[PDB]
Amino acid sequence: LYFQGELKREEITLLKELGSGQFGVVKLGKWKGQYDVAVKMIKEGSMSEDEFFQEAQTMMKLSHPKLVKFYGVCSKEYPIYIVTEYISNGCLLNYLRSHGKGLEPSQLLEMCYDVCEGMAFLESHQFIHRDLAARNCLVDRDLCVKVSDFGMTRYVLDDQYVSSVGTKFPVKWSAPEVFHYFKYSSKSDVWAFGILMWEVFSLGKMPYDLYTNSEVVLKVSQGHRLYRPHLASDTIYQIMYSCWHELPEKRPTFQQLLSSIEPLRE
Numbered sequence: 334l335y336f337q338g339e340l341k342r343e344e345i346t347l348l349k350e351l352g353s354g355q356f357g358v359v360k361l362g363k364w365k366g367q368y369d370v371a372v373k374m375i376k377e378g379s380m381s382e383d384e385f386f387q388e389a390q391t392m393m394k395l396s397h398p399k400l401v402k403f404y405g406v407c408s409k410e411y412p413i414y415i416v417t418e419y420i421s422n423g424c425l426l427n428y429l430r431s432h433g434k435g436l437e438p439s440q441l442l443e444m445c446y447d448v449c450e451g452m453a454f455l456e457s458h459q460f461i462h463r464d465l466a467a468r469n470c471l472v473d474r475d476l477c478v479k480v481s482d483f484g485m486t487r488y489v490l491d492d493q494y495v496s497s498v499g500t501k502f503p504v505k506w507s508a509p510e511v512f513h514y515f516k517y518s519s520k521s522d523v524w525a526f527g528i529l530m531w532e533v534f535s536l537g538k539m540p541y542d543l544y545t546n547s548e549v550v551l552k553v554s555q556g557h558r559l560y561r562p563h564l565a566s567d568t569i570y571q572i573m574y575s576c577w578h579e580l581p582e583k584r585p586t587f588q589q590l591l592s593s594i595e596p597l598r599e
Contacts, residue, residue: 334368336393340405340416345372355500356380356484357412361419369419370404373483377411380484384499385413392486395458399451401471401481415483420471426537428472433536438564439599440476445530446594447478452526453587460486461517464502465525467532489519492582497521504546505539509579512550518581526590527576534562534569568597 349361357375364370375385385408393403407414422428425444429436448470455462462469462485469481485502489495494516508524510516528540540559541549558577561570572593578584585593 334402334404334418335396336403337405338389339409340364340407340414342407342409342414345370345407345414345416347372362416364404364416368404370416371419373415373417374412375415380413381499384484387488388483388486391458391488392460392482395454395460397451397454398477399447399479400454401479401483403483417481417483420479421474422472422476424468425470425472425478426467426532429467429533429537436536438534438566441533441564442569442594442597443476443599444470444472444478444533446591446598448480448526448529449587449590449594451480452522453591455480455482455486456519456522456587459488459490459519461489461519462522462525463487463500463517464506465522466503466506466529467537470529487517489517491519494518505541505549508581509553510581513554520581520584520586523576523581523584523587523590526587527573528559530565530569530573530576531559531562534565536564 344365346363347360348363351359351361351371354373356379357373360372360374362370362372389406396402402418404416404418406416452462452465462480462482464485469485471479471481473479487495497511497515497517504512506525506528508521510518511521531540558574572590576584
């Protein structure tokens, strides 16, 4: 299956609700009476049409094993359906908090690698993820991690900056240029990927658990960073720590992070 563009609403049966996302409710559904799917239902007003028509006509076409696969959309009226593949083990954040104590460190590293592979593919198409966190990743039957990116991408040419105006996502995953200068760079999601790595090896603990957004911004500016997770070796902490450099120009690309993690795999 592949992104087919527009789909027929009558060919999508809704079975159960998976939860309320950021832009609307997501329901379990059967597509063509054969395929299991997840269906984002966007009420009118809950989403920019410009963003939707840009994402639908460029991002959604990008198919990769580590990105949630888009099958199509129903956009003739509201509520607009965004139909993606269903992921059998659900949200990575929930999975870490429920089954993380039984995962080996090599599996935790494998999750970070999966996310890095998918993000390296978006990076090669000059797209950044504006909210790269464990809450936007999904775990399939093989414990392979897929990145969900709907309504969270933004076209950024390499080494360039763009305005961060738009949906305000949690600042505990945002880089200095975002919360200080209101700009994204082509490596703002690299910073967030370091926070994701911290989530994974912390088994879903909240970063800066005891501190508010105002306190985190202040202390990140002062050089303070997240600590080495209990399950992370010195080398693995060195990787995620490098994502947290103040200057975007001194952060690595997902391709460079891809080559740093490969030697550490099982």
